[PDB]
Amino acid sequence: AWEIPRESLRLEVKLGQGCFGEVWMGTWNGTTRVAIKTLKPGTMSPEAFLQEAQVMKKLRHEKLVQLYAVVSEEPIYIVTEYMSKGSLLDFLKGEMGKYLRLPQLVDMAAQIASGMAYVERMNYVHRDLRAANILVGENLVCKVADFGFPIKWTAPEAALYGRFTIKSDVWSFGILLTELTTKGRVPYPGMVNREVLDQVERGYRMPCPPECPESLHDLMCQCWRKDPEERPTFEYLQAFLEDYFTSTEPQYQPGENL
C-alpha cells in the first residue's frame, strides 16, 4: 500500500550516486516535488525488499526524511520528501560553512538528536549516523536519512563485535558533533582506520575543537564512553542541545569561526 506505479514518477535531475545506486530529484503524480533513491538491479529481490523496508515505513517523525512511496519491482525506487540543500556534509563544507556559528550549529544538532530521540522511543537503531546521512532543507532544517563500514563514526563494540544499539548510535552522534563544530572535517585527522581503532581501544578521544566550548566537548566525551550504558540517551542529548545557550553556556560570545 506504500506501492505506486513507476510511471507515476518523473525522474528529472541526477543529484548524486553511491555504492548501492543513484538519487534523483523528480516529480510524483505530475504535481509533487520528490526525491527518488534508485537501487542497482540485483541488489535485492522484491520479497527481500519488503522484509527490510518495514522500518522506514513505520518511522514517521518531523526530523526524519519522510518516505512517500515505493516501487518494489526491479529496479526498486524509494520515493521520499525532497530536501532542498543536500547533505549536511556538503552543506558544512560549502559556501554556507563560512557563516555558520555555534548557535546555528547547536540548533542543527538538536534537530538531529530529536530525530534520533524518536528512533530511540521506537526502539530502533540507525547504524550509520553521520553528517553525510543528514539532509538539510530550507530554514536550516535538518533531518536524519538513509537506511540501506565507516569505522571513524562507529562505536568500538559495534565495529569489533557487531554490537549495534541505540548506544552505538549515540557514539556516532558524538562524532557528528565534531563534524558540525569543524565545518565538516573528517574525524581523527591524519589517522587511518586501523590507527583509529587501536587508539580508541587505548582510550584516545578527539580533543576539544578550536573555539568549541569545553562543555560541548564534554558532551562529545560522554557520547564516547567505553561503556555503552554510560552513554547518554538522545532524549538527554536533545534537551541539553535545545537548552544549551541558557542552561549551559549563558555567557557565550561569537568568535571568528564558532
Curated annotation (Swiss-Prot):
Tissue: Expressed to high levels, and with a high degree of kinase activity, in certain fully differentiated cells such as neurons, platelets and macrophages. Isoform 1 is widely expressed. Isoform 2 is expressed only in the muscle.
Location in or out of the cell: Cell membrane; Mitochondrion inner membrane; Endosome membrane; Nucleus
Residues the record marks as active site: 128
Entry comment on modification after translation: Dephosphorylated at Tyr-252 by PTPRJ. Phosphorylated on Tyr-252 by c-Src kinase (CSK). The phosphorylated form is termed pp60c-src.
S-nitrosocysteine carried by residues: 223
Positions of post-translational Phosphotyrosine modification: 161, 252
Annotated ATP binding sites: 15-23, 37
Signal peptide as annotated in the record: none
Family, similarity comment: Belongs to the protein kinase superfamily. Tyr protein kinase family. SRC subfamily.
Protein task: Non-receptor protein tyrosine kinase which is activated following engagement of many different classes of cellular receptors including immune response receptors, integrins and other adhesion receptors, receptor protein tyrosine kinases, G protein-coupled receptors as well as cytokine receptors. Participates in signaling pathways that control a diverse spectrum of biological activities including gene transcription, immune response, cell adhesion, cell cycle progression, apoptosis, migration, and transformation.
Protein name, entry field: Proto-oncogene tyrosine-protein kinase Src
Location of this fragment in the whole protein: 259 to 533 of 533
